Each structure stands twice: as structure tokens, then as C-alpha cells.
């Protein structure tokens, strides 16, 4: 099942501007400035820009939460692996999308050296079909299973991954973008997607791609993604008449923002 497949390049960085904000809870609010303290992506922080296909997809730290974004139309990115040792010694969380659904499992997975999903293409380049699942060699001691609907100009998809008190929380947003290779400058809050009562530790994670077998070996289209990290900061959130967050102030950004947060402006 597993396939042995890698050149590493120095990192590139982009400007997060004012993105990565999400609804802190499920309480409806409107026409109000609400101050909250939570894990948010710091304003104007440096976000790492990864290119899956120049080929490697490195294991990254999870820290205290992750902001993930991608801009691809080929449906190359399928899912993520979250865990610690990422082997049969401990429980790991596997979140993978396929052709019709999304499957989330927590098991003592023994993952492949370089895990992926296999696909193949039609005579044309507008159609594809699944081939084989090559993410792990074995799995046992399963404690959690969940199945639902799929999670995944250009299409911009944004996710936030948090792990608090055993609950793995996912937020998401899907919007159109008209930029070639950057993050949009504007504001949009992410909404709750799913809340999984798993109860495990996560320190590292990896992104799973769908690859096809070419005459030059296993490859994919020009998939790329951005990774940022959350910090404990105070935000002032502006709820409009319809209860939608339309703006925000990062109270730790600078003296000007501190003044705005103090005066609730």
C-alpha cells in the first residue's frame, strides 16, 4: 500500500493582514462592539507560504492552534493528519475528504513514510477517478469515528484548527479571490464547522494530497498553501445590524489599536 517517494527549499512569507478572525462562540449578537479574548491570528503577522509542487510536504508543529489557507481549483488537497509521534505508539487524528464524503477517524495509525491518496485522470484533463488509499499501512484501537459532507478566478479556502480541553474545533470559510499568488486585503470572519469530542494531544501535523502516477513518477498540479499560528490576544469585534462580524481590532498590535479598544471605537 505505502509508496516510497524529496528536495527542500527555504521558506517564503506573506502578509496575513487582517484575516484569520472567527466567531468566538455561538451566541447571536448584533449592532454591538464586543470585546473577547481568544486564540487569534495576530494582525499583519508573517505567514509561511508552502509550495507542494515546485517535491516535499514537511511535518509542521501545531503549537497552540493553526491557521491554514489554500488557493487551488484542482482539488489536490484532501485532508490533514494531526498527532504526536504519528505512529502506532499513540492515537492520531485522520481527517480525509474523498469523492463524496469526509471521514474522520481516531486510531493508533501506522502511517506511511510519505502518505497520500492515489487518483487517475480521464483522456481529457477535466475528469478524474479514485485509484487507491495510501495513507497508512495499518490501524487499530479506534476510539472515534465521524462521517459527514465534504469540507473541500480562484477558490480561496480558509480553516482554523484548535484543540481545547479535548475538543478539536474546526472553523472555515469559502470565498472567491481575484489575485494571482497572494492573500486578499479585506475582512471576513470564519464560521464553526464541526466540534469533535476526541480527547487527544496534538503537537504536529501534515497535509495530505491526491497524487497521480505520471511517466516521471508520482506528482500533482501546482498546489500551494499558507500556514500561520494563533496567539492569545484581545480583539474588539464589530457586529453589524444582521449580526455579522464586519471588522476587528487587534488590541495588541500598537498604541493606536490600544486606544481604539479602550474607547470602544
Amino acid at each position: 500500500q505505502c509508496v516510497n517517494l524529496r528536495t527542500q527549499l527555504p521558506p517564503a512569507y506573506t502578509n496575513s493582514f487582517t484575516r484569520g478572525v472567527y466567531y468566538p462562540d455561538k451566541v447571536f449578537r448584533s449592532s454591538v462592539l464586543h470585546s473577547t479574548q481568544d486564540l487569534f491570528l495576530p494582525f499583519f503577522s508573517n505567514v509561511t507560504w508552502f509550495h507542494a509542487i515546485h517535491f516535499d510536504n514537511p511535518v509542521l508543529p501545531f503549537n497552540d492552534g493553526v491557521y491554514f489557507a489554500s488557493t487551488e481549483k484542482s482539488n489536490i488537497i484532501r485532508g490533514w493528519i494531526f498527532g504526536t509521534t504519528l505512529d502506532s505508539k499513540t492515537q492520531s487524528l485522520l481527517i480525509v475528504n474523498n469523492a463524496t464524503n469526509v471521514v474522520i477517524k481516531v486510531c493508533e495509525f501506522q502511517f506511511c513514510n510519505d502518505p497520500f491518496l492515489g487518483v487517475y485522470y480521464h483522456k481529457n484533463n477535466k475528469s478524474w477517478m479514485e485509484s487507491e488509499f495510501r495513507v497508512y499501512s495499518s490501524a487499530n484501537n479506534c476510539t472515534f469515528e465521524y462521517v459527514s459532507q465534504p469540507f473541500l478566478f480562484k477558490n480561496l479556502r480558509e480553516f482554523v484548527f484548535k484543540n481545547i480541553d479535548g475538543y478539536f474545533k474546526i472553523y472555515s470559510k469559502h470565498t472567491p479571490i481575484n489575485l494571482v499568488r497572494d492573500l486578499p486585503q479585506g475582512f471576513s470572519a470564519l464560521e464553526p464547522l464541526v466540534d469533535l469530542p476526541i480527547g487527544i494531544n496534538i503537537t504536529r501535523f501534515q497535509t495530505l494530497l491526491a497524487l497521480h502516477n505520471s511517466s516521471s513518477g508520482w506528482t500533482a498540479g501546482a498546489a500551494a498553501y499558507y500556514v500561520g499560528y494563533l496567539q492569545p490576544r484581545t480583539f474588539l469585534l464589530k457586529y453589524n445590524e444582521n449580526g455579522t462580524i464586519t471588522d476587528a481590532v487587534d488590541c495588541a498590535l500598537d498604541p493606536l489599536s490600544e486606544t481604539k479598544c479602550t474607547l470602544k471605537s
Partner: antibody
Amino acid sequence: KESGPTLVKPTQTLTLTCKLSGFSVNTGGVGVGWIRQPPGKALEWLALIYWNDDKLYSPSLKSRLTVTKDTSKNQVVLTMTNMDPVDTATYYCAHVLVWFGEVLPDAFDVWGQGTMVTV
Amino acid sequence: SYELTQPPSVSVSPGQTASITCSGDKLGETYASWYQQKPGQSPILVIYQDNKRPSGIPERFSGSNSENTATLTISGTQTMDEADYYCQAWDKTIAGFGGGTKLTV
């Protein structure tokens, strides 16, 4: 496994049912098609239904064909209206393989036994 | 429907290699498939996506698709393989079947 009426009069509506097993009709990637074969003649495509309730019909017969599926019994139902004597044929149901990127049809792999219909 | 043309028959002795062909206008631009049918029985898929066998289909079967012509080949044709073979292909999601080739063994 095809079942239903075997003898109908001209200008009548016929309903045939295909019973499937080994898979559920509600499972993603699943499709079911209907094909007829007049005595001594080649196979003729009638219509197909996908797990996502999308449907395709052969343009020459579409106006007289309806396809629906029973999501509780795991059965697929074909209805053909205003049948002529020339529509005498053996009717078959089969599983339909489909592409996922663009929803294009592929091939019919799992077939039933065939039910003979005389108009 | 999509146009598909087949020879009316192929005649071989048991143990010989059978060659059953099918042609069209867009056949080489798409995926071809082949069926084996006997009188009173449903057709069985033997080849799909030009040259792939379904599980359970004898290794005697192989094929290809080039120059808008599809070919089904039977190596060591058995008397049990004496059947009418049909080609199938799609054109913009529209189905079509060939006339059918009678293989005599």
C-alpha cells in the same frame, strides 16, 4: 434482478423494477442504468440514474422514459409510456460506473438477468 | 446514439487467437469497453477503459484502442468463449453500442 409485467397492449404504460444487492442505492459512486434488447438486435441505451439523483436519457426515447429510485428498498424503477409493438425487447438493469471530476459515464459492470417484454 | 461499427463475425479454431474489432469517429478520443453475450443471457463486461479487466475475467482477454479502432483479443480461445461480442463507447455522455460480432469457435 428485473421483475414486472411481461405482456402489455399497444399505447400502454409499463413499469419495471430492478432489485439490487451487494451495495446500497444510496451509496456514493453508485449508479443504475436501463438497457433494452429487441430479439436478434444490439443493445439500446434507455436511461441512467445516479446516486445524486441526476439522470440522463437517450434523446430518441427520453420523451417517453422516466426513471426513479426507492431509497428504502434499494430498488430502481423504470417507466416507459405509449409503447409500440416495435418496443418488444428484453429489458436489463446494470450498475453504472461514473467519473467524479466531471460527471461522465463509464461502463456497465454488474448486470441483472433480463426480463422479456411483449407489447 | 454514438456510432460504432463491427464486423458481423469472426471464425477461429479452439486454441487460436481471436481478433474482434470496432471502429468509430471519436473512439480513440474516449474510453472503449467490450461485452460478451450469449442468447438468453445478459452481456458480461470483459474489458473496460480500453485495456482493463474486471475481477473474475479470464487472462485470455486483452485489448487496445488506437487510430479510432478498438480491439478485443482472446488468447487460446475456448469453445466456452463462443459468444457475440459488443463494443460500447460514450460521446458527450450519449451512449452507443456496436452491431455485435459473432465469434465462432
